[PDB]
Amino acid sequence: KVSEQLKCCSGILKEMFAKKHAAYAWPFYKPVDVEALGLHDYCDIIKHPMDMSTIKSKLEAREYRDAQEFGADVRLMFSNCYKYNPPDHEVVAMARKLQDVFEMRFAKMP
Ligand SMILES: CCc1nc([C@]23C[C@H]4C[C@@H](C[C@H](C4)C2)C3)[nH]c1-c1cc2c(=O)n(C)cc(-c3cc(C(C)(C)O)ccc3Oc3c(C)cc(F)cc3C)c2o1
Numbered sequence: 001k002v003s004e005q006l007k008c009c010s011g012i013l014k015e016m017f018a019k020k021h022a023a024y025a026w027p028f029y030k031p032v033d034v035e036a037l038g039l040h041d042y043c044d045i046i047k048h049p050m051d052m053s054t055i056k057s058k059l060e061a062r063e064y065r066d067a068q069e070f071g072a073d074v075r076l077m078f079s080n081c082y083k084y085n086p087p088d089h090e091v092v093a094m095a096r097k098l099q100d101v102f103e104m105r106f107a108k109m110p
Contacts, residue, residue, distance in 0.1 A: 005067040005109060010059055012105045016052060021101055024094040028052050028077055045084055050077040067109060074102050 016025055031051045034042040043049070055073050064070045081095040 002066055006064060006070070008109045009064065009067055009070040012102065013052060013056060013059060015105060016098060016101060021098060024097040027091050027094055028098060042084060046080045048076060050080060071106060
């Protein structure tokens with residue numbers, strides 16, 4: 001059922017938070033601290049910021065109708081990173097390693 005795939009989405013997000021991915025996952029745990037980093041143009045270029053904490057809140061508040069809507073937010077998080085940053089930047093390399101974890105689990109969902 002729809003509520004079985006949303007249970008898997010929780011498991012996928014929990015995995016993305018787990019210790020074994022912590023070295024490359026941490027930049028996506030919470031909203032980009034644009035204040036502290038002095039990224040004055042970030043909110044102008046990124047219209048819909050997204051992060052794993054915001055996704056966790058939305059998932060616990062059952063604001064995702066299906067896995068596809070959860071998926072769109074995970075991919076928005078990564079797209080925001082790929083959009084703002086050059087391809088050589090360390091955060092892009094970290095995004096890709098975490099996205100690979102997401103894409104494999106998301107694809108193998110029953
Ligand atoms: C100095 C921060 C930064 N500067 C850039 C640019 C550098 C350059 C000028 C202009 C346009 C550029 C080309 C991208 C800004 N991008 C970032 C950037 C983008 C990020 C991003 O998309 N995500 C998802 C996370 C981070 C980020 C966030 C944080 C906290 C404070 C926890 O919010 C710390 C460090 C971050 O990014 C870095 C990272 C992940 C690894 C690294 F080695 C250095 C970072 C600055 C960043 O930092």
